[PDB]
PDB file of N, CA, C and O in Angstrom:
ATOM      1  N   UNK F   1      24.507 133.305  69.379  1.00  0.00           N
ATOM      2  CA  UNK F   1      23.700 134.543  69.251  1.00  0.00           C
ATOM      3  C   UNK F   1      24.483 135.871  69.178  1.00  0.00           C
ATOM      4  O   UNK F   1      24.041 136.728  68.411  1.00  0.00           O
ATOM      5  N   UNK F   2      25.447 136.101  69.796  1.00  0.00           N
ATOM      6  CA  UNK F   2      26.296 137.037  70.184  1.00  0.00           C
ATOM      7  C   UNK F   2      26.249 138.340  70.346  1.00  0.00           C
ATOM      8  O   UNK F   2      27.012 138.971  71.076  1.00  0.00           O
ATOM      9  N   UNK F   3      25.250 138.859  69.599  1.00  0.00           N
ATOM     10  CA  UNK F   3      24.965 140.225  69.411  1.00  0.00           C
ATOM     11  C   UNK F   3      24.319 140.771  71.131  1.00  0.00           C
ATOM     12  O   UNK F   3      24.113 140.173  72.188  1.00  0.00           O
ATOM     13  N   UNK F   4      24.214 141.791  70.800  1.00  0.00           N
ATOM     14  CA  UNK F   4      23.528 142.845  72.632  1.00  0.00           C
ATOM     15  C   UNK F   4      22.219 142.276  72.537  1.00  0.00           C
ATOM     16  O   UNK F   4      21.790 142.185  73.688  1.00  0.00           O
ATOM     17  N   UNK F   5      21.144 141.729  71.480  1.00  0.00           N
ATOM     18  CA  UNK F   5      19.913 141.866  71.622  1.00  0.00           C
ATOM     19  C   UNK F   5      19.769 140.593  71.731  1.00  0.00           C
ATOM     20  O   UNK F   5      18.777 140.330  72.411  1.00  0.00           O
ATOM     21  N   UNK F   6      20.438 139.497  71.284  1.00  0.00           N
ATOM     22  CA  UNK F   6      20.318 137.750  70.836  1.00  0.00           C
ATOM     23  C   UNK F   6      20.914 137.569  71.961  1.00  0.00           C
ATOM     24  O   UNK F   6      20.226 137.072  72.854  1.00  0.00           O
ATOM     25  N   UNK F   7      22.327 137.902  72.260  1.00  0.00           N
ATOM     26  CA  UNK F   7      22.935 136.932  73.773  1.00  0.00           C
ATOM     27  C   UNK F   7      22.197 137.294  74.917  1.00  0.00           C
ATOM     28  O   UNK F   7      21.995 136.406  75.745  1.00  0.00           O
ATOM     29  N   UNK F   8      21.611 138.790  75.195  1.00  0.00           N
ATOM     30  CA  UNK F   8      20.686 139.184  76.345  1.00  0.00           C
ATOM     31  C   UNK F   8      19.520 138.442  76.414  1.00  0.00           C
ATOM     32  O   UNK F   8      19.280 137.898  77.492  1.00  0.00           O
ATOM     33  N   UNK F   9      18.811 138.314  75.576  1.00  0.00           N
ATOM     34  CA  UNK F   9      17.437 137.661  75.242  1.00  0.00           C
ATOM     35  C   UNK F   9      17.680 136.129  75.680  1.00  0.00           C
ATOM     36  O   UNK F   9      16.958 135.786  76.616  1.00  0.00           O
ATOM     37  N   UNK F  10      18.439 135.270  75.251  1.00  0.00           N
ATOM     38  CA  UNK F  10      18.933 133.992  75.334  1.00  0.00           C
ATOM     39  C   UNK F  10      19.150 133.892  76.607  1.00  0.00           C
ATOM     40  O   UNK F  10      18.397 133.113  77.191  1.00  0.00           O
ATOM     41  N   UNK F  11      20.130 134.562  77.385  1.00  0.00           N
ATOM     42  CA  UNK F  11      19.838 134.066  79.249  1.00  0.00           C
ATOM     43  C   UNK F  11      18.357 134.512  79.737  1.00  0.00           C
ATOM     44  O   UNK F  11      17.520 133.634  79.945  1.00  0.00           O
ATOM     45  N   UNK F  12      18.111 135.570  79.876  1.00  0.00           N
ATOM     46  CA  UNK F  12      16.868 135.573  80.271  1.00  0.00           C
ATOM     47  C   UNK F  12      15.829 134.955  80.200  1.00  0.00           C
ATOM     48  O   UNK F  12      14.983 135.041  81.090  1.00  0.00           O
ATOM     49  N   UNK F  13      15.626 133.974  78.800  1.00  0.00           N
ATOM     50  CA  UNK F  13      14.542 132.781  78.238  1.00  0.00           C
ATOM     51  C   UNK F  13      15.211 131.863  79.486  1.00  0.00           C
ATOM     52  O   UNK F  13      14.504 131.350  80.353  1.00  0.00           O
ATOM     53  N   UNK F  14      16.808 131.720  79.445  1.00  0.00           N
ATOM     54  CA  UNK F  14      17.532 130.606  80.000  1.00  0.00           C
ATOM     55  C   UNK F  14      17.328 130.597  81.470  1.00  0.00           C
ATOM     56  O   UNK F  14      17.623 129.501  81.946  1.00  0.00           O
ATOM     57  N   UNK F  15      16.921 131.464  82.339  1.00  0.00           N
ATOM     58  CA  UNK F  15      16.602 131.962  83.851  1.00  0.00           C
ATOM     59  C   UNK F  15      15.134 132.366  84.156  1.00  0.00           C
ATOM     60  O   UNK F  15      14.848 133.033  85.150  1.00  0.00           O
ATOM     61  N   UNK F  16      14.231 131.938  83.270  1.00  0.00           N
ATOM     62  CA  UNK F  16      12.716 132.208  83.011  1.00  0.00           C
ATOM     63  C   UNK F  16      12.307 133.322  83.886  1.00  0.00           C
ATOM     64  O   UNK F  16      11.578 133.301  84.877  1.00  0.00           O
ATOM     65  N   UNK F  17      12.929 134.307  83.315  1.00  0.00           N
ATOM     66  CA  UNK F  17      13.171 135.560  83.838  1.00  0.00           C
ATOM     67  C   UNK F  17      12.156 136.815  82.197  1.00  0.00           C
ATOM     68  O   UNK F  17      12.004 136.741  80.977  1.00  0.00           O
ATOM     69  N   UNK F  18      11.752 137.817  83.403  1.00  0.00           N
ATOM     70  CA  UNK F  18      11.033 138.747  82.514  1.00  0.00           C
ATOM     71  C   UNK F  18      12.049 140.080  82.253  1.00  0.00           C
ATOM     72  O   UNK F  18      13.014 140.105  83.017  1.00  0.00           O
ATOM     73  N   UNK F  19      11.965 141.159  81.304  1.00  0.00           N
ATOM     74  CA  UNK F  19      12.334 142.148  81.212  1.00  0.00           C
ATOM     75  C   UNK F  19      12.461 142.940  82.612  1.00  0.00           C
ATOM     76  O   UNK F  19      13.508 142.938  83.260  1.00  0.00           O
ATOM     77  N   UNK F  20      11.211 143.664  83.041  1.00  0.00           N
ATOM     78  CA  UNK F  20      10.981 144.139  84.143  1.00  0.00           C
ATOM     79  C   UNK F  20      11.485 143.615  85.464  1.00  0.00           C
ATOM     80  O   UNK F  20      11.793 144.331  86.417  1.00  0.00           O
ATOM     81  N   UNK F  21      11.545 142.212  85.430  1.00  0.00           N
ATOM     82  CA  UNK F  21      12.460 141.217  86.940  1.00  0.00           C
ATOM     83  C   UNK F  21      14.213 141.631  86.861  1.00  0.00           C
ATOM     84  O   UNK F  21      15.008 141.578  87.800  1.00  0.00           O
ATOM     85  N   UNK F  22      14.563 142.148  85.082  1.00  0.00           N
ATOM     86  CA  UNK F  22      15.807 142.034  85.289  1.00  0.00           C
ATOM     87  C   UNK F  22      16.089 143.468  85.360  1.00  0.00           C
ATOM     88  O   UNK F  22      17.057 143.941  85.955  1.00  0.00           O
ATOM     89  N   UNK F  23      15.300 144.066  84.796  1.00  0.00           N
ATOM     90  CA  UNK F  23      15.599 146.021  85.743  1.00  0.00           C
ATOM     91  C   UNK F  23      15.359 146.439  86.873  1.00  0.00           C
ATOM     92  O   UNK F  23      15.877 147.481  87.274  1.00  0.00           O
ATOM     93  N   UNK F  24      14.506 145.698  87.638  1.00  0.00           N
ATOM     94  CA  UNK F  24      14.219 145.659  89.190  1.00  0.00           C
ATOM     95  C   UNK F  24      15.290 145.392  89.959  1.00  0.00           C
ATOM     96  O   UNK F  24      15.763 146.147  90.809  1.00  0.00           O
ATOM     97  N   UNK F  25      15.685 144.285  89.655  1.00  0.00           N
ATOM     98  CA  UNK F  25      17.127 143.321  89.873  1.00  0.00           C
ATOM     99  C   UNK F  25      18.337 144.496  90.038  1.00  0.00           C
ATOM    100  O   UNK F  25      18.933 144.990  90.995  1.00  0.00           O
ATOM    101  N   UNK F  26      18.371 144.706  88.205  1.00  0.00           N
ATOM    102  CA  UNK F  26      19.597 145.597  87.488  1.00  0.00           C
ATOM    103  C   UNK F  26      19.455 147.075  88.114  1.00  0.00           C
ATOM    104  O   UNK F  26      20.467 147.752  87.936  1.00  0.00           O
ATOM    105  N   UNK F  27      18.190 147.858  88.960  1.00  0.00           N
ATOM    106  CA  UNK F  27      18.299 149.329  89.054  1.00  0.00           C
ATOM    107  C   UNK F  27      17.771 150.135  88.466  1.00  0.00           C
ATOM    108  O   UNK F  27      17.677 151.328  88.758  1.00  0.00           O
ATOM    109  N   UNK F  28      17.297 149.503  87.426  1.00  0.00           N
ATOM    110  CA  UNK F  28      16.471 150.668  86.174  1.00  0.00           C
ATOM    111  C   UNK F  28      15.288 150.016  85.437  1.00  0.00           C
ATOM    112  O   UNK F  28      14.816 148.902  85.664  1.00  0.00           O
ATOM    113  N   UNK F  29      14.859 150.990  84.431  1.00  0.00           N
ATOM    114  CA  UNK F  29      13.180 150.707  83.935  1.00  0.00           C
ATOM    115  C   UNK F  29      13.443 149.465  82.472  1.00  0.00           C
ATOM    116  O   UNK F  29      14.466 149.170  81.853  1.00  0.00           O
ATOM    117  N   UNK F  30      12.117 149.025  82.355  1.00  0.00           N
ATOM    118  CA  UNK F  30      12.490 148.076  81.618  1.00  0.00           C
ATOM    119  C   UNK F  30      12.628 148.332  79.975  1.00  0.00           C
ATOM    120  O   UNK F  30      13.339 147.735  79.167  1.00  0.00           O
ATOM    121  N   UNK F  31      11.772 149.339  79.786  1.00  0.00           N
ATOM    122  CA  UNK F  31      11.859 150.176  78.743  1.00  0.00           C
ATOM    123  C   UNK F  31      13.541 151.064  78.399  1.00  0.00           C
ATOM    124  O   UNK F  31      13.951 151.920  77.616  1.00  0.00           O
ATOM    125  N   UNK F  32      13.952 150.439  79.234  1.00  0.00           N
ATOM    126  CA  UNK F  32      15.856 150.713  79.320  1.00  0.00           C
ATOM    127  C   UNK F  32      16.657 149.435  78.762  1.00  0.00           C
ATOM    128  O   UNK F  32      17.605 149.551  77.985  1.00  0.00           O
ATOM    129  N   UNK F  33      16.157 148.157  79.256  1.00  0.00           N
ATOM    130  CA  UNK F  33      16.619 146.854  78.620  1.00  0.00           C
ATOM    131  C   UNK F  33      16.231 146.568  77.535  1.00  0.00           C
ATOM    132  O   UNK F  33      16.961 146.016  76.711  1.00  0.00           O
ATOM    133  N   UNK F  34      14.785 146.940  77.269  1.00  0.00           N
ATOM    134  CA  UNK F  34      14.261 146.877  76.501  1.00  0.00           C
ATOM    135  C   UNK F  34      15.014 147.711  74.630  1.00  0.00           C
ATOM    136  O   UNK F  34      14.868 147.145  73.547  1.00  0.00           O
ATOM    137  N   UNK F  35      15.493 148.612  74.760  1.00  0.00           N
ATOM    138  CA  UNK F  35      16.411 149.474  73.929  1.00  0.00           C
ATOM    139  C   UNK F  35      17.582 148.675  73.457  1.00  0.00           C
ATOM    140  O   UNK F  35      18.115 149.026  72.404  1.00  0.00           O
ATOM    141  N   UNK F  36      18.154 147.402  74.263  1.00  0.00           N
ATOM    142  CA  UNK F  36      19.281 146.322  74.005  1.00  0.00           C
ATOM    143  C   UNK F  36      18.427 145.487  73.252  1.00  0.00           C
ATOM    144  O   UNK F  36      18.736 144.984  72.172  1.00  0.00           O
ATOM    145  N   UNK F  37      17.618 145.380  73.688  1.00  0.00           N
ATOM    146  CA  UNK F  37      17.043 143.602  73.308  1.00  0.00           C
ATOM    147  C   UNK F  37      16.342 143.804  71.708  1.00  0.00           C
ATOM    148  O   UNK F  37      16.245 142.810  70.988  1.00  0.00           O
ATOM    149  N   UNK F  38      15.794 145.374  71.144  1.00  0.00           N
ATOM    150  CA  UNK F  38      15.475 145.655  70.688  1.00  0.00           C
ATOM    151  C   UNK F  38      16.083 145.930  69.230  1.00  0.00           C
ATOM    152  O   UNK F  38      15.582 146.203  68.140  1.00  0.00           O
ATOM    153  N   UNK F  39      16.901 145.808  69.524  1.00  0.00           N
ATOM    154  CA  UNK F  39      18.543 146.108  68.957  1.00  0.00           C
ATOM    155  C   UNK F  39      19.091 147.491  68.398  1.00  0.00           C
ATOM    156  O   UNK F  39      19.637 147.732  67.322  1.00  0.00           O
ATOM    157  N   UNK F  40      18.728 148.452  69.624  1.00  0.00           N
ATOM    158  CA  UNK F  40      18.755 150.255  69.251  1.00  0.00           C
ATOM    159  C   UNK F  40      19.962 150.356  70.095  1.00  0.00           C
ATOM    160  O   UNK F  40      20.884 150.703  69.357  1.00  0.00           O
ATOM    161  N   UNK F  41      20.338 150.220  71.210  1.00  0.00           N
ATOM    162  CA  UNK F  41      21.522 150.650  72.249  1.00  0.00           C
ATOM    163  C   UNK F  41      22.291 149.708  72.554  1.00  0.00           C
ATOM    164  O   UNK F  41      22.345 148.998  73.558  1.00  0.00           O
ATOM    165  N   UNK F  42      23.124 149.755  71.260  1.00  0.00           N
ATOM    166  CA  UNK F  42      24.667 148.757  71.371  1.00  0.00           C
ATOM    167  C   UNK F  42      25.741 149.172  72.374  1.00  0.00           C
ATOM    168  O   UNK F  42      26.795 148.568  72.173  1.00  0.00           O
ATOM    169  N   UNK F  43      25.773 149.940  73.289  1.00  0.00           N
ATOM    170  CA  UNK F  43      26.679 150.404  74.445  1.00  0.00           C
ATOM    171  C   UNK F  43      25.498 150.903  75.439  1.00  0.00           C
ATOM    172  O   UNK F  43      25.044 152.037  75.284  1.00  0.00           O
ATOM    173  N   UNK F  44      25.074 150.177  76.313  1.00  0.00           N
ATOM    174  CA  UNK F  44      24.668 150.616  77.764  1.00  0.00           C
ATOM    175  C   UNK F  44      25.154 151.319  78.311  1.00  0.00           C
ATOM    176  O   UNK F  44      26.314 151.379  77.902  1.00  0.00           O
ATOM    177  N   UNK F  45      24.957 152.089  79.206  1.00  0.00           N
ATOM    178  CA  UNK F  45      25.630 152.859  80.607  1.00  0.00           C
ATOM    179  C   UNK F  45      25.180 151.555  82.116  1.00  0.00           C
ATOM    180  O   UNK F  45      25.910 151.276  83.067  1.00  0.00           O
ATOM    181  N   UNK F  46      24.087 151.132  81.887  1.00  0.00           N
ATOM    182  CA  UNK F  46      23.734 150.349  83.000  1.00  0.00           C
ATOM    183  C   UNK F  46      24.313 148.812  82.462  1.00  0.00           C
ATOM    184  O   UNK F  46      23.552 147.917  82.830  1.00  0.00           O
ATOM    185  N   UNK F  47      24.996 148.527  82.006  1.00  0.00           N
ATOM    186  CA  UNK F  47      25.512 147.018  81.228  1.00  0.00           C
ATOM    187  C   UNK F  47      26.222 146.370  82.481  1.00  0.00           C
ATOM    188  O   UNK F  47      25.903 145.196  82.666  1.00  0.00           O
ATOM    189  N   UNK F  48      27.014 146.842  83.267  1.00  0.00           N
ATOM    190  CA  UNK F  48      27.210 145.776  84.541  1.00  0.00           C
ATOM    191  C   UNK F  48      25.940 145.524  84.988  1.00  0.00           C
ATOM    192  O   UNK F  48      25.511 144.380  84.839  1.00  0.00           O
ATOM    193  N   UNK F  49      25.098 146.539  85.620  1.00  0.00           N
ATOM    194  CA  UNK F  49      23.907 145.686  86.466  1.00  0.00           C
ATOM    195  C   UNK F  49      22.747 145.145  85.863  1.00  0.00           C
ATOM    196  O   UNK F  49      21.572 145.232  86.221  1.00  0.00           O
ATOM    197  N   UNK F  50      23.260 144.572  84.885  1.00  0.00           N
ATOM    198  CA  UNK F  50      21.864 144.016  83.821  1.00  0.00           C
ATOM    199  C   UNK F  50      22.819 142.498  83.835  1.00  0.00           C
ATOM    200  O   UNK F  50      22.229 141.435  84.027  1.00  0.00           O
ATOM    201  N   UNK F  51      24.275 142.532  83.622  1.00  0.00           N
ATOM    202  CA  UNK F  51      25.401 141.563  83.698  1.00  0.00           C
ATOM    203  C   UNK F  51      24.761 140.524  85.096  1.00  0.00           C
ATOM    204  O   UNK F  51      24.322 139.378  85.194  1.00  0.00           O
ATOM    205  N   UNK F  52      25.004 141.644  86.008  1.00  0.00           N
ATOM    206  CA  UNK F  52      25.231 140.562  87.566  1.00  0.00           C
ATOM    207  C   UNK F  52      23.654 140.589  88.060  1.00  0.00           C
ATOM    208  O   UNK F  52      23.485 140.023  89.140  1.00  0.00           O
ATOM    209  N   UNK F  53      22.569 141.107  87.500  1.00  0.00           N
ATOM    210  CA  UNK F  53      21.299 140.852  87.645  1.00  0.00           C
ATOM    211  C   UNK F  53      20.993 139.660  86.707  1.00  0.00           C
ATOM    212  O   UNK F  53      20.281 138.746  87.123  1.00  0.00           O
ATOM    213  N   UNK F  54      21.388 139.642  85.745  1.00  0.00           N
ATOM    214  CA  UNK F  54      20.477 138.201  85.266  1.00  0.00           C
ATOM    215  C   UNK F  54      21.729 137.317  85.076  1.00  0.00           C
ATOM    216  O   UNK F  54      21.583 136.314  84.378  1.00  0.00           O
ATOM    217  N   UNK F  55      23.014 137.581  85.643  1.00  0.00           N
ATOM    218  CA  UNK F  55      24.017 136.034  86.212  1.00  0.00           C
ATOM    219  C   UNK F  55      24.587 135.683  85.481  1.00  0.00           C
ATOM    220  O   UNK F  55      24.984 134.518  85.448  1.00  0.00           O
ATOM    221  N   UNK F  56      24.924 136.808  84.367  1.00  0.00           N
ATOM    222  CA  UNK F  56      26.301 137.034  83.170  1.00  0.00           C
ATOM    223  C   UNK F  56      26.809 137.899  83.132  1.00  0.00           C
ATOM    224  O   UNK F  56      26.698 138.750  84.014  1.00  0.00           O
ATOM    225  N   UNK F  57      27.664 138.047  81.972  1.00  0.00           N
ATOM    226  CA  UNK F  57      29.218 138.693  81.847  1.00  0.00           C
ATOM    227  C   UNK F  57      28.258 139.523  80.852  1.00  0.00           C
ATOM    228  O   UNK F  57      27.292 139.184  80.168  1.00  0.00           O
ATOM    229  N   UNK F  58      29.182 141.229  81.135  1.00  0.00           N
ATOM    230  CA  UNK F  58      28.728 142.227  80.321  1.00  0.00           C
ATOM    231  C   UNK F  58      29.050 141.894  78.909  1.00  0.00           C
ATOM    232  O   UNK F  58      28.161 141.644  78.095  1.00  0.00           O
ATOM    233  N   UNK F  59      30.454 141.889  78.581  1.00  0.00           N
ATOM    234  CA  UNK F  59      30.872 141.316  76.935  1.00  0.00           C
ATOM    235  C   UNK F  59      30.508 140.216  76.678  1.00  0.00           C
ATOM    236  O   UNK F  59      30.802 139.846  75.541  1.00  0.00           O
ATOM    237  N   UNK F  60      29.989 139.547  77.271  1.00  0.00           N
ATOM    238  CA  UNK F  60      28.767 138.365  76.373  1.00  0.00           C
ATOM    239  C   UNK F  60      27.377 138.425  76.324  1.00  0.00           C
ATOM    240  O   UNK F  60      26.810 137.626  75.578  1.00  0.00           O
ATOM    241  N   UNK F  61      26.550 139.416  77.136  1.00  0.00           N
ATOM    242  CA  UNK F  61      25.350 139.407  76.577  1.00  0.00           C
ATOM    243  C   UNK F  61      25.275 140.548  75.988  1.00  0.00           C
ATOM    244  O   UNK F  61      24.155 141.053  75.911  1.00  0.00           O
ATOM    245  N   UNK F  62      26.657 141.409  75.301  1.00  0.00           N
ATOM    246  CA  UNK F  62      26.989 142.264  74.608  1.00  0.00           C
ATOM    247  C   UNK F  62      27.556 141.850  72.946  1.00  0.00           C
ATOM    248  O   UNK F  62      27.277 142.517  71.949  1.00  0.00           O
ATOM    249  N   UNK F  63      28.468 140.499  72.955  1.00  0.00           N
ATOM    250  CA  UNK F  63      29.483 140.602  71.621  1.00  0.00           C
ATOM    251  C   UNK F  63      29.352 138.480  71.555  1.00  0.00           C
ATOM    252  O   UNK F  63      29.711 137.653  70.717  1.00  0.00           O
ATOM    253  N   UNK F  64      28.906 138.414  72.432  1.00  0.00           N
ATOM    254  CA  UNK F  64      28.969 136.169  72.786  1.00  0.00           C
ATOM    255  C   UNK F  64      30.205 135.786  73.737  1.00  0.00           C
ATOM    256  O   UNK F  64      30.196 134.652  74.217  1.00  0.00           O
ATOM    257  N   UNK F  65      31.271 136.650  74.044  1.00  0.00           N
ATOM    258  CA  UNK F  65      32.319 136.373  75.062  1.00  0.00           C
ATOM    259  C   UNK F  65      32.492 136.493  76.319  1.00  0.00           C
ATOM    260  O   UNK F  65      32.813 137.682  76.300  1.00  0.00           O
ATOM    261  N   UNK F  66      32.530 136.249  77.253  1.00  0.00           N
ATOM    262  CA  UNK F  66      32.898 135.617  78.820  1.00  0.00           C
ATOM    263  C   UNK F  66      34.367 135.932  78.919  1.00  0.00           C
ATOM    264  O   UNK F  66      35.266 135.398  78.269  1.00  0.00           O
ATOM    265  N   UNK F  67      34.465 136.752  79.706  1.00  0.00           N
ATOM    266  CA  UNK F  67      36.108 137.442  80.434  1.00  0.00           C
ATOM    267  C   UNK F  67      36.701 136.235  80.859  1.00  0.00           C
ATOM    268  O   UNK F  67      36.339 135.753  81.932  1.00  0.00           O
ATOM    269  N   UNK F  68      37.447 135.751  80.264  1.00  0.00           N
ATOM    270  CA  UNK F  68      38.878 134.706  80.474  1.00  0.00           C
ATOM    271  C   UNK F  68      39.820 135.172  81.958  1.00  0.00           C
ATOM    272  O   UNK F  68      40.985 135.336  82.321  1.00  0.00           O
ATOM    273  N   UNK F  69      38.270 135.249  82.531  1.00  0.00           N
ATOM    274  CA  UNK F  69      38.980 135.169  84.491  1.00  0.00           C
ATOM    275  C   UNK F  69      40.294 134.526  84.940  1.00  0.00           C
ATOM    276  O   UNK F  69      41.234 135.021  85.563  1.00  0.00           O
ATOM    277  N   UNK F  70      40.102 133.235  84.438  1.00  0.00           N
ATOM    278  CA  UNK F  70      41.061 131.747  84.683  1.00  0.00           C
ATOM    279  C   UNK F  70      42.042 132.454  83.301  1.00  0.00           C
ATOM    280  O   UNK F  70      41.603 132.699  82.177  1.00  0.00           O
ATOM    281  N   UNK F  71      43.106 132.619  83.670  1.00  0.00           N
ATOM    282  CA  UNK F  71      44.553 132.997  82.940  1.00  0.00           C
ATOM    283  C   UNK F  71      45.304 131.602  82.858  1.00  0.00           C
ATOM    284  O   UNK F  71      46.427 131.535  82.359  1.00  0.00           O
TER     285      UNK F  71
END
């Protein structure tokens, strides 16, 4: 999927999780996630807590990649 609006959308189906559960979660309104998923706001300001609210990596439910933690 890779894109901000396809890889975001794809965990959230994957965690049967709603918009609004993951801005509650993340700190902000859903009409804010909603702007990613939509495919209007390709750079977040809130993109970590949307990351560790729905239990992924910012550059993959941003671009399809996962930070190569393990070196």
């Amino acid at each position: 999927m890779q894109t901000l609006s396809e890889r975001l959308k794809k965990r959230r189906i994957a965690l049967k999780m709603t918009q609004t559960e993951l801005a509650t979660k993340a700190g902000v309104k859903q009409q804010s996630i909603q702007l990613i998923e939509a495919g209007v706001t390709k750079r977040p300001r809130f993109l970590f807590e949307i990351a560790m609210a729905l239990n992924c990596d910012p550059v993959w439910l941003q671009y399809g990649t996962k930070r190569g933690k393990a070196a």
